[PDB]
């Protein structure tokens, strides 16, 4: 369908420890597949999906070298950022970067992404034209002038239309979704009331919608819910709950919408 | 395949 590749990079400045803590995580279709961490005993890029383990040794060698390049790029950029914001002392200075490419059925680049944040706030982003920059404040405007002078955008556009799309293509043949499994549990409360908790487990990607209904109609009652959370095995969990009268709970239905399902589920708690 | 940033720093 609409395939994608992302790399999520984080650098946290360090004092007289020269090198910042540098972490990079790569995703294919929103699923982790490679990882680099500078605080490893030997910092290396590593597979994080079984299907990446087939890549040749030179691939891991080339990638690890690029990570050491990034680490140095973030180190100098964090020193520059320190000066852009005058004093502003903190024991935490964080530069984050998101980049990657959305791939279409036609196999061309659909959307390219390159975005930076400093201290948890938008700093600078490449616009969708992959030629101009959006700068969030005075410091990011210094950076933008500098990158317009040196032609930085052309380097990033070339990666996004080229290498990014090309290796996304290859990964999608290497590892040639997972629909929710749902059920309802039943928790009696006091005074003739009971909680109906609709669970969705084992699904991927995280995006899901859970709704309780009475005969095709949504309930005016307020639905208690829980934010979608990782199970720890690559799948996610969610639940929505509702408080109904004891002896009436068979009439209520849970709906589960997820893209791994041709059609949304309908299920209920069935009494004996 | 990871992006190596353009050498001009922030």
């Amino acid at each position: 369908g609409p395939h994608s590749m992302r790399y999520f990079e984080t650098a946290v400045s360090r004092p007289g420890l020269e090198e910042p803590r540098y972490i990079s995580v790569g995703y294919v279709d929103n699923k982790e597949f490679v990882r680099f961490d500078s605080d490893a005993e030997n910092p290396r890029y590593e597979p994080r999906a079984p299907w990446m383990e087939q890549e040749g040794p030179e691939y891991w060698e080339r990638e690890t070298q690029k990570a050491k390049g990034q680490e140095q790029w973030f180190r100098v950029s964090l020193r520059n950022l320190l000066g852009y914001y005058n004093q502003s002392a903190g024991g935490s200075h964080t530069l984050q970067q998101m980049s990657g490419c959305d791939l279409g059925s036609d196999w061309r680049l659909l959307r390219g992404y390159l975005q930076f944040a400093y201290e948890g706030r938008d700093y600078i982003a490449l616009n969708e034209d992959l030629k101009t920059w959006t700068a969030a404040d005075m410091a990011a405007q210094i950076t933008r002038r500098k990158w317009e002078q040196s032609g930085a955008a052309e380097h990033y556009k070339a990666y996004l239309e080229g290498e990014c799309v090309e290796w996304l293509h290859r990964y999608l043949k290497n590892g040639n979704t997972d629909s929710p499994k749902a059920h309802v549990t039943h928790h009696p409360r006091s005074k003739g009331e009971v909680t109906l908790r609709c669970w969705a487990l084992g699904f991927y990607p995280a995006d899901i919608t859970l709704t309780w209904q009475l005969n095709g109609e949504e309930l005016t009652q307020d639905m208690e819910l829980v934010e979608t959370r990782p199970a720890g095995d690559g799948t996610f969990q969610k639940w929505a709950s509702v408080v109904v009268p004891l002896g009436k709970e068979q009439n209520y239905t849970c709906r589960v919408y997820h893209e791994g399902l041709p059609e949304p589920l309908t299920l209920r708690w069935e009494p004996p | 395949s990871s992006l190596c940033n353009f050498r001009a720093y922030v």
Partner: T-cell receptor
Amino acid sequence: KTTQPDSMESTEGETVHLPCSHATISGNEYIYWYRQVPLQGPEYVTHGLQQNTTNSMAFLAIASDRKSSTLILPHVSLRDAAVYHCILSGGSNYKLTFGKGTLLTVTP
Amino acid sequence: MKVTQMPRYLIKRMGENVLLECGQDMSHETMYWYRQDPGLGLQLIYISYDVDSNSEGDIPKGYRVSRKKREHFSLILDSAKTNQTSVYFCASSFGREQYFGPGTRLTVLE
């Protein structure tokens, strides 16, 4: 690594074409041209990634497979005589490796 | 965009110290020290990525560098050898091209 001819001769006023071969170039590597008048400091001329490039002193053309290029010096003066270095420069890399380059002479 | 180098020419006795200085007032992050023997190529001695962030280039033996501020970069020959007779070029970069200084011709004599 790039390959250039050892030397090139022209008379002032002519258009000069300096060829450069770089068949093991990678997608992130720019093509940079520097010149050096002997015993003087080398001087940037131009560079490009794929899209052809025009500036005040020169034109650059890059083949569509990126495996060769040529520097174009429109109406050479005597002051353009120099060694011209074609050098690959990783977009993420600050180092350059200079070769022998092409010695351009221009006679009046 | 201007890189400064003094002196243009220098005579040193064999075994004496040598300090060559390079300046740039645009506060570029990266600076370089090259040497060029006549009729040969420019060879990188050391590159400085930032203050106290220096890496060996192709021919580091017999040299060391100091980068305490971004605006200067110094090349130090602790005990000059005759085969260090050469032309030394320093450079700087912001991320686009390199800007070269006018060079220093050092002659080391017995």
